[PDB]
TrEMBL record, chain C:
GO cellular-component term (any): photosystem I
Regions that span the bilayer: 6-30
Protein name per the record: Photosystem I reaction center subunit VIII
Lineage, broadest ranks: Eukaryota, Cryptophyceae, Pyrenomonadales, Pyrenomonadaceae, Rhodomonas
Family affiliation: Belongs to the PsaI family.
Keywords: Chloroplast, Membrane, Photosynthesis, Photosystem I, Plastid, Thylakoid, Transmembrane, Transmembrane helix
Primary localisation category: plastid
Compartments where found: Plastid thylakoid membrane; Plastid, Chloroplast thylakoid membrane
Pfam family, one: PSI_8
Function according to Swiss-Prot or TrEMBL: May help in the organization of the PsaL subunit.
Domain of life per record: Eukaryota
BP GO annotations: photosynthesis
UniProt xrefs under HAMAP family: PSI_PsaI (MF_00431)
UniProtKB/TrEMBL annotation, chain F:
Gene expressing this chain: psaL
Phylogenetic placement of the source organism: Eukaryota, Cryptophyceae, Pyrenomonadales, Pyrenomonadaceae, Rhodomonas
Residues annotated as transmembrane: 72-98, 118-143
Keywords carried by this UniProt record: Chloroplast, Membrane, Photosynthesis, Photosystem I, Plastid, Thylakoid, Transmembrane, Transmembrane helix
Membrane topology per record: Multi-pass membrane protein
Organism: Rhodomonas salina (Pyrenomonas salina)
GO biological process, alphabetically ordered: photosynthesis
Keyword Repeat appears in the UniProt entry: no
Protein name: Photosystem I reaction center subunit XI
Regions annotated as coiled coil: none
Domain of life of the organism encoding this protein: Eukaryota
Ligand binding (chlorophyll a 1): 35, 53
UniProt family annotation: Belongs to the PsaL family.
TrEMBL record, chain G:
Keyword Lipoprotein among UniProt keywords: no
Gene3D superfamilies in the cross-refs: Photosystem I PsaD, reaction center subunit II
Protein name as annotated: Photosystem I reaction center subunit II
An annotated GO BP: photosynthesis
UniProt-listed InterPro entries: PsaD, PsaD_sf
Principal location listed in the UniProt entry: plastid
Gene: psaD
Signal peptide (UniProt feature, chain positions): none
Organism from which the protein derives: Rhodomonas salina
GO CC, one annotated term: chloroplast thylakoid membrane
Cell location: Plastid, Chloroplast thylakoid membrane
Key words, A-Z: Chloroplast, Photosynthesis, Photosystem I, Plastid, Thylakoid
């Protein structure tokens, strides 16, 4: 029982060939770290949630570079990606001092939805439910033609685009953390570090402390 | 277990046997004393070492002698 | 002091790891049936 | 924790004995049976012309206005709170004894 | 006891072999790292006001650990925490430090294992013996020559690192 | 009505059935705790207990430790928790070595493998829970004080 | 002879003084006796129990606890009908007391004397004499 | 057996389609902690109070009773509470609603035992529910505008805590 993606390695025992977006890639056997029946379902739901959040973040960063909604510019000014998260948070009760609750409203409603999914994942883990990973019944426009779970091909598409967007939004965040350019300026400025935008330190400035002292710090 | 001995000075008064809280001692037939009986120690694995037998014994030096030895669950009187 | 780094290396090891290891291994030896 | 109603759930106070805790009825009756007598006013500086419940209910709001700040040691909140709950716990205890046991 | 793969066994031989290969890497890496001054504030002496009496050293000048030494130690602390988590909660496939108690010991290699140039156990054990011997060799060379280990490693490699 | 009875119908066992011991509320809490909850592997029991214990461990070390008034207070508190967690894991390991004979059973806590599973889960969860507390305290100024940021 | 496990137990409301895990994993002791009355007695492990008219049965952790009850049952209720058993977790029930149907303080034929030393206690051997020798000090 | 409102959740055990206003919404399992009938009586009480509260907000915008402007100058939504505690109006309403709650407490014990339906006080003077089919849809509509008025009452009083305007004055003065 060898693996498809890596022919030489032995196939990871917990993975089943019946789970979408599977090519036998699990060298570290993260799928075997818990013996429980629903741990692989937890891992699959974690992958899909990470992928959906990442797709939203990647599209969000691109479109934020394209334009902004009316009035946003007079409040936040000229921040671009993670800095806009910081800028709102400097102007919000509890975290900062101001008249805004933008990231907090997002936390409120996402958190209501997420505690609901908390109960869903807990029920799905212990085998009390015959629900697959990622399925919340959300399919308002009939796209799977009678099943909200969707077809095997469209969930494979969802997982693959999700994995791509995880990588892509990670790239975009780090490219911003050093150039300050944001997605479209970075992709335009294919010679880069030559002229970069002065952008603020994040809420985690310690992480950018080996750049100059140990690493080259071309910027 | 504890080691319990009966010496031939036993007058067969049965007092050690009555005082024993763990039924270690009993009376066996004899012909060396007027009472026709001597104390015996057949169940010393149950001896807790209280030495109530020695207290009960009336001979000048004790006919019954307890020698405290290796400790067990029984001889340490442990209910746990 | 010459080799002044030695107390800051050896005192935590002798004072914490050394008893922590002999207590750990003595406990195993005193609690084994065979 | 949880509250059990007068109507029969499968709650058991111990291993095999089901016992209806009357948490709605006792808590409601004990609260009202203590708060209403306690409405009796008194022109004393602790009460301030109100009753013990009302001076207390007034002192919850005044200290809630300064929400992060706690009431001070000489603040009347603590004395009012201790006295109100002491009677309230006593009426709850006596109310549970009276209702659960005598059943009427 | 000692039937769990501890002591002079091939399990211990392999494990110490892996650590000495990593250690040769780490010694080379620190030689190159402090040769170019890429350890920040390498000479700066830590203050007991911030770190407490663990920072004290009692060398006549400064009476405190240097920042380079603390940074190297914190790097080792990273791989020690990894080491503990891998010892007590290992991976599903990973070779375990301790053994089942009734395990069958791997057969001892001997003077030299079969030359299997792959990512094999023969290559691992050969290179591990070589690295352990290299650790000793570097230690003795530095002690006798009087030079620092960092300098001794640089000279043996032909001053490539710095 | 009587609230105290013999324990599990046995008048001569060394226990009583009291409301603290055997109420529906108590039974509920005990049965749903990670140590006693059904459908949990010993490894998962260790993880949930470990996450809980490691998370609270960080706070007393950080707020009351020797380096509490320094800016390295949280780092010192986490490493102090990590040191306690490692010491406790050694305690768990040696308990397993001396308390359980080696048998194939692994889905019970009181087995040699099941204890080794539980110990593995507890160490991972403890470091995970302590790390989560470290992240939360590092970033949120309310947790760094006792809530004293508001005053 | 064998313990009839179905014998009813004295009415007791329980106590913390009863037996612990060592009784269910090492050994347990039981005592049975006949009562002519439905009367209150004192448990060796705690408070008071009521023995039922007819046959009673208890379980205790120590042999001394069964005999301490037997002493009390014979001194205040004049029940001499008590039989003490040892019970192992294998199910084996071992009759203990009175071992041959007759009380130990009464002589019985077929009892062999154990522990009996032919001389008086002063005639033992000095420890030096039996040092590095297996010979016993009782002569 | 899946929840209707939350498709990925199992149908709440204590909940049933016989209950008025049921949609399968209890993702937290609070219907098991407290008794479902106590919760129904509590919800219906909250429904009716907040329906009066929302209508009271709206009407007090639209008009006030004769002489009320004498007593309340500028107090609008919850300021009128503060000034009419001084006057006797709030104490009067508190006394009479507490009078009613005494028999409401008897009725809650009655519905706990199982004799009475929650929220059922037999108050149908104008015979609205006589048909037997209207009665069900009236129960559903009562809970629907009851829940909506709970949310609305909160959403107006907080809009007034922000601006001070009140509901209609918030709308007309954007
Ligand atoms: C968190 C992001 C954010 C922020 C900070 C703002 C902030 C602002 N917006 Mg924008 N807006 C947003 C998201 C945001 N909006 C979104 C998601 C939409 C939906 C497409 C809009 C649609 C929108 C419109 C259509 C308008 C604004 C306008 C305004 C300004 C209002 C001035 C005023 O008198 O209000 C009066 C307006 C309202 C109370 C509602 C309109 C204000 C600076 C207005 C503006 O630019 O005027 C200067 C305007 O006309 N916003
Ligand atoms: C009986 C002898 C003895 C005793 C009581 C001590 C006592 C001490 N030494 Mg040690 N030392 C000794 C011999 C001894 N020394 C010898 C002979 C050497 C040369 C190898 C050293 C080298 C040495 C160093 C390099 C350092 C100390 C340090 C210290 C201090 C802290 C403890 C420590 O880190 O130990 C560590 C000690 C060693 C690793 C050396 C081995 C200790 C001896 C040889 C073994 C004695 C065994 C003993 C007979 C039986 C003990 C078992 C007992 C339960 C029966 C403490 C004052 C530290 C210090 O100064 O801190 C301020 C430190 O850095 N010592
Ligand atoms: C503090 C309030 C209070 C007090 C003083 C009493 C007192 C009494 N109740 Mg009542 N009861 C109460 C609250 C109270 N109840 C509430 C809230 C409920 C509803 C849940 C009931 C429901 C109830 C029923 C259904 C029945 C009683 C009955 C009784 C009588 C005897 C049984 C009993 O509870 O013994 C309490 C014994 C005493 C109070 C006397 C002992 C004297 C000592 C000093 C006790 C003092 C305790 C405490 C310090 C007093 C606190 C007062 C205040 C500061 C809180 C007794 C007169 C029964 C009865 O006799 O019928 C009329 C009966 O059938 N009660
Ligand atoms: C708590 C609410 C409240 C308050 C504070 C008042 C207060 C007042 N009302 Mg109003 N009133 C109320 C509710 C209230 N009313 C209600 C619910 C009704 C029935 C719909 C009325 C119907 C009413 C009438 C018909 C009149 C008053 C009048 C008056 C005033 C008495 C003046 C006089 O000369 O006699 C007084 C300020 C009189 C007045 O002068 O008002 C202009 C008057 O004619 N009241
Ligand atoms: C059961 C009979 C009853 C009685 C005797 C009263 C008596 C009173 N009410 Mg109350 N009231 C009652 C029922 C009753 N109310 C009910 C069922 C409600 C509905 C919850 C209210 C709601 C209410 C409010 C909101 C107010 C009163 C007020 C008054 C006072 C009017 C004084 C005046 O000049 O009257 C002459 C006026 C009239 C006859 C007007 C018609 C007086 C204390 C007013 C007051 O000052 O409170 C103390 C006031 O503002 N009442
Ligand atoms: C029946 C329910 C209901 C309705 C119709 C409204 C309607 C309104 N509310 Mg209220 N609100 C409600 C419930 C409701 N609310 C509840 C339950 C709360 C919780 C306490 C609030 C808390 C609240 C606050 C704190 C604010 C509003 C505001 C608003 C207004 C603008 C809508 C807006 O900004 O949302 C934006 C909608 C979206 C982003 C949808 C996507 C609007 C008049 C705002 C306003 O202008 O009032 C001054 C405002 O600041 N509401
Ligand atoms: C596996 C993870 C499961 C949960 C996952 C949730 C989040 C996962 C995705 C996150 C990615 C998006 C980032 C969003 C970050 C939100 C940050 C945030 O909102 O913070 C939320 C809070 C508070 O943090 C801030 O609070 C401020 C006011 O002080 C503001 O109001 C802000 O809302 C908030 O950001 O942080 C915590 O949650 C801390 C943990 C819970 C603390 C409860 C109170 C403390 C209890 C202590 C008492 C116990 C006994 C003490 C003993 C005596 C002590 C002296
Ligand atoms: C499901 C459901 C529905 C729905 C829905 C919705 C809203 C679905 C949204 C789907 C989305 C937004 C998917 C987006 C994926 C993004 C990807 C794969 C890109 C990653 C970036 C990369 C590779 C890059 C890069 C880059 C690098 C690193 C450097 C940068 O300088 C620039 C650059 C860009 C070049 C609806 C409502 C229709 C109903 C239906 O019945 C059911
Ligand atoms: C070098 C080094 C390390 C190390 C290490 C190790 C495991 C060193 C082990 C050395 C050993 C076990 C040497 C054995 C020698 C026996 C001989 C030569 C006899 C033959 C007949 C570590 C990993 C701590 C990192 C550190 O940054 C540098
Ligand atoms: C203090 C004070 C007084 C007063 C007063 C008064 C009248 C106070 C009244 C306060 C009320 C009724 C607050 C209600 C808040 C409602 C909330 C938070 C619901 C949110 C819904 C959510 C989050 C989403 C729900 C949902 C949505 C659609 C999405 C998911 C699904 C679902 C979960 C169903 C006085 C009178 C003394 C005056 C004095 O001067 C000040
Ligand atoms: C909002 C906010 C923030 C934020 C933020 C965010 C969103 C941070 C996101 C970070 C992410 C998602 C980084 C992605 C890392 C993926 C990596 C490194 C893969 C690496 C390497 C390989 C070889 C992959 C190889 C692979 C390939 C090629 C195929 C073979 C298999 C495989 C090995 C799997 C902050 C922190 C800035 C703070 C700020 O105040 C506010
Ligand atoms: S020491 Fe106690 S138990 Fe042992 S024989 Fe003497 S009296 Fe009996
Ligand atoms: S008490 Fe002494 S003398 Fe009496 S029977 Fe026992 S051993 Fe013999």
């Amino acid at each position: 029982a060898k693996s498809k993606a890596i022919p030489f390695l032995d196939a990871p025992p917990a993975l089943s060939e019946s789970m979408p977006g599977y090519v036998g890639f699990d060298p570290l056997w993260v799928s075997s770290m818990l013996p429980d029946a629903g741990y692989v379902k937890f891992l699959q739901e974690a992958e899909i949630k990470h992928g959906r959040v990442a797709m939203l973040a990647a599209a969000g960063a691109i479109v934020q570079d394209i334009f902004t909604f009316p009035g946003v510019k007079s409040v936040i000014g000229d921040v671009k990606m993670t800095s806009v998260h910081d800028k709102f948070l400097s102007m919000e009760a509890g975290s900062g001092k101001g008249d805004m609750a933008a990231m907090h409203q997002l936390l409120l409603w996402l958190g209501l939805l997420e505690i609901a999914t908390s109960v869903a994942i807990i029920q799905s883990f212990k085998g009390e439910t015959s629900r697959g990973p990622g399925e919340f019944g959300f399919d308002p426009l009939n796209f799977g033609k009678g099943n909200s779970a969707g077809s095997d091909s469209y969930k494979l598409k969802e997982i693959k685009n999700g994995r791509l967007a995880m990588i892509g939004i990670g790239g975009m965040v780090h490219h911003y953390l050093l150039t300050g350019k944001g997605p479209l300026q970075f992709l335009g400025g294919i010679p880069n570090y030559k002229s970069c935008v002065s952008h603020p330190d994040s809420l985690l400035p310690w992480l950018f402390k080996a750049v100059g002292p140990v690493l080259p710090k071309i910027c | 277990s504890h080691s319990v001995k009966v010496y031939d000075t036993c007058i067969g008064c049965t007092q050690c046997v009555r005082a024993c809280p763990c039924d270690v001692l009993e009376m066996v037939s004899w012909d060396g004393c007027k009472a026709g009986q001597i104390a015996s120690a057949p169940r010393t694995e149950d001896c807790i070492g209280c030495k109530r037998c020695e207290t009960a014994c009336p001979t000048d030096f004790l006919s019954v002698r307890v020698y405290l030895g290796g400790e067990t669950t029984r001889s340490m009187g442990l209910a746990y | 002091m010459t080799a002044a780094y030695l107390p800051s290396i050896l005192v935590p090891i002798i004072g914490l790891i050394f008893p922590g290891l002999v207590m750990a291994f003595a406990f195993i030896y005193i609690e084994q049936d065979e | 924790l949880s509250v059990v109603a007068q109507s029969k759930s499968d709650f058991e106070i111990s291993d095999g004995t089901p016992y209806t805790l009357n948490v709605p009825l006792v808590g409601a009756a004990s609260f009202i049976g203590w708060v209403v007598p306690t409405l009796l006013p008194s022109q004393i500086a602790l009460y301030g012309g109100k009753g013990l419940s009302t001076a207390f209910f007034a002192s919850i709001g005044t200290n809630l206005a300064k929400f992060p700040a706690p009431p001070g040691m000489t603040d009347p909140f603590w004395l009012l709170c201790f006295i109100w709950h002491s009677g309230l716990f006593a009426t709850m205890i006596l109310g549970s004894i009276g209702y659960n046991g005598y059943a009427g | 006891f000692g039937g769990r793969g501890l002591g002079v066994t091939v399990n211990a031989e392999r494990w110490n072999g892996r650590h000495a290969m990593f250690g040769i890497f780490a010694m080379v890496m620190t030689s190159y790292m402090k040769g170019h001054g890429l350890i920040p504030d390498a000479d700066k002496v830590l203050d007991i006001a911030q770190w407490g009496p663990l920072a004290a050293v009692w060398d006549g000048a400064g009476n405190g650990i240097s920042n380079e030494r603390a940074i190297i130690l914190i790097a080792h602390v990273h791989v020690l925490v990894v080491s503990v988590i891998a010892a007590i909660a290992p991976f599903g496939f990973q070779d375990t430090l301790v053994k089942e108690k009734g395990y069958t010991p791997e057969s001892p290699a001997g003077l030299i294992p079969p030359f299997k140039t792959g990512l094999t156990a023969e290559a691992e054990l050969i290179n591990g013996r070589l690295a352990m011997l290299g650790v000793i060799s570097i230690v003795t060379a530095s002690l006798f020559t009087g030079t620092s280990v960092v300098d001794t490693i640089n000279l043996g490699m032909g001053k490539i690192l710095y | 009505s009587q609230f105290i009875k013999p324990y599990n119908d046995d008048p001569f066992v060394g226990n009583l059935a009291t409301p603290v011991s055997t109420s529906s509320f108590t039974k509920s809490l005990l049965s749903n705790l990670p140590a006693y909850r059904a459908g949990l592997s010993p490894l998962l029991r260790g993880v949930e207990i470990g996450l809980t214990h490691g998370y609270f461990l960080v706070g007393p070390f950080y707020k009351l430790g020797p380096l509490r008034n320094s800016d390295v207070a949280l780092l010192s508190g986490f490493f102090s928790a990590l040191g306690l967690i490692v010491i406790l894991v050694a305690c768990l390991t040696i308990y397993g070595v001396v308390s359980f004979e080696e048998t194939e059973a692994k889905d019970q806590l009181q087995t040699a493998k099941g204890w080794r599973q539980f110990t593995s889960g507890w160490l991972v969860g403890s470091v995970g829970g302590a790390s989560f507390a470290y992240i939360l305290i590092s970033n949120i100024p309310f947790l760094q004080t006792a809530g004293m940021s508001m005053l | 002879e064998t313990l009839n496990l179905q014998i009813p137990s004295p009415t007791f409301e329980g106590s913390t003084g009863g037996w612990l895990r060592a009784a269910e994993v090492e050994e347990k002791y039981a005592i049975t006796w006949t009562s002519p009355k439905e009367q209150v007695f004192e448990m060796p492990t705690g408070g008071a129990a009521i023995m039922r008219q007819g046959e009673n049965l208890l379980y205790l952790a120590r042999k001394e606890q069964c005999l301490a009850l037997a002493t009390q049952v014979k001194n205040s209720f004049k029940i001499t009908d008590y039989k003490v058993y040892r019970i192992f977790p294998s199910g084996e029930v071992q009759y203990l007391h009175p071992k041959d149907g007759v009380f130990p303080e009464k002589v019985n034929a077929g009892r062999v004397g154990v522990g009996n030393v032919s001389h008086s206690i002063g005639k033992n051997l000095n420890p030096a004499q039996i040092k590095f020798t297996s010979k016993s000090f009782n002569g | 057996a899946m929840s209707e409102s939350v498709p990925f959740l199992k149908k709440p055990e204590a909940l049933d389609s016989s209950m008025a206003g049921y949609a399968g919404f209890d993702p937290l399992g609070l219907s098991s902690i407290a008794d479902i009938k106590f919760l129904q009586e509590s919800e219906i009480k909250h429904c009716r109070i907040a329906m009066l509260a929302a209508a009271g907000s709206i009407a007090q915008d639209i008009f006030t009773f004769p002489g009320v402007s004498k007593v309340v100058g500028t107090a609008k939504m919850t300021g009128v509470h503060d000034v009419l505690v001084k006057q006797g109006a709030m104490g009067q309403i508190l006394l009479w609603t507490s009078f009613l709650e005494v028999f409401g407490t008897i009725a809650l014990l009655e519905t706990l035992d199982g004799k009475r339906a929650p929220g059922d006080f037999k108050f149908d003077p104008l015979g609205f529910s006589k048909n037997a089919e209207t009665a069900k849809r009236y129960q559903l509509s009562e809970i629907k505008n009851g829940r909506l008025a709970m949310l609305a009452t909160g959403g107006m009083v907080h809009g007034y805590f922000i601006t001070g305007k009140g509901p209609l004055e918030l709308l007309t003065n954007f």
